[PDB]
Amino acid sequence: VRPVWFPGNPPPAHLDGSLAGDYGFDPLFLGQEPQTLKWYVQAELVHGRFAMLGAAGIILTSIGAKVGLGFPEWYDAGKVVVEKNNIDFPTLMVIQFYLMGWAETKRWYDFKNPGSQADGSFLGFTEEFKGLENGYPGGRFFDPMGLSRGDAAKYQEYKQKEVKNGRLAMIACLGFAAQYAATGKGPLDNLADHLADPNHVNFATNGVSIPIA
């Protein structure tokens, strides 16, 4: 009864519509096993939330570069930051995996053993690391405003928004990479060029996407 990605086709048995963003899309049956699906649900949310941060960061800095505030392009930012600020790349890389390793490992072992991180072993904190649902930590640290601790109906609506905006951001980040490879320019240079002449400046005329053209 619920809308599906391919109208007319029944949804698969293992997608029962409870999860956020459930449109019955799993043509390769990758999440058929329930234990695999829980792992994939968290994988989609981690990917989506990183993509949303990346899309917003790329967009903001691209605007700054466009209006001449001196920001580099996202594909040049890495070089400019280390050279301008005299930062050792390997040292920054090691710190990143220490901090991400700690946060990721604790997340990893909450999936393997829910609520196991709330025993007080980490500096005595108990409730903030209990977790609420698979992929939805909650609590005072991860949900300081308690928007998951108010109206239940409102909370479910936010889950639908989060995953949909997350999927859109993942597609957008794929677009940034593909557009940079095809055009060699920044995302808003591409947008500006399209707006100037939409009929003649698009992927069909970039000389790469349609090689036979």
Partner 1 sequence: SRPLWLPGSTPPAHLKGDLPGDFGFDPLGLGANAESLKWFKESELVHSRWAMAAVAGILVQEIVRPDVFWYNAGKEVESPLGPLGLLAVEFFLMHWVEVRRWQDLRKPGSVDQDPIFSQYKLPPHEVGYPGGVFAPFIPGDLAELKVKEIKNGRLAMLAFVGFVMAAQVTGKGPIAALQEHLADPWGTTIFSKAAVVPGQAVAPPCKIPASVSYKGIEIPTPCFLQGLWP
Ligand X SMILES: CC(/C=C/C=C(C)/C=C/[C@@]12O[C@]1(C)C[C@@H](O)CC2(C)C)=C\C=C\C=C(C)\C=C\C=C(C)\C=C\[C@@]12O[C@]1(C)C[C@@H](O)CC2(C)C
Binding residues for all-trans-violaxanthin: 26, 28, 74
> What's the burial of 83, exposed, middle or buried (CB within 10 Å: 0-12/13-18/19+)?
exposed
Residue 203 interacting with ligand X (CB under 6 A):
no
Backbone angles phi, psi at 144, to 5 degrees: -60, -35
Residue 192 CA: distances (Å) to CA of 58, 108, 157: 16, 43, 34
From CA 196, how far away is CA 111, in angstroms rounded?
Answer: 50
Question: Out of 173, 186, 188, 190, which residue is the one contacting ligand X (CB under 6 A)?
Answer: 173
Residue 13 touches which of ligand CHL, partner 1, ligand X, none (Cβ within 5-8 Å per kind): none
Residue 208 interacting with partner 1 (CB under 8 A):
no
| Nearest Cα residue to 201 out of 209, 191, 193 | 193
* Min separation Cβ 9 and ligand CLA, Å: 12
Site string for partner 1, 142-161 (x = CB under 8 A): ---xxx-xxx--x-------
Residue 174 interacting with ligand X (CB under 6 A):
yes
Per CB under 6 A, contacts with ligand CHL among 78-117 are 78-79, 82, 89, 92-93, 96
Per CB under 6 A, contacts with ligand CLA among 88-107 are none
HEC assignment per residue over 65-107: HHCCCCCCCCCCHHHHHHHHHCCCHHHHHHHHHHHHHHHHHHH
Which residues sit at the interface with ligand CLA, rule CB under 6 A? 5, 15, 19, 21-26, 30-31, 40-41, 43-44, 47, 50, 53-54, 56-57, 60-61, 63-64, 69-72, 77-78, 80-81, 167, 170-171, 174
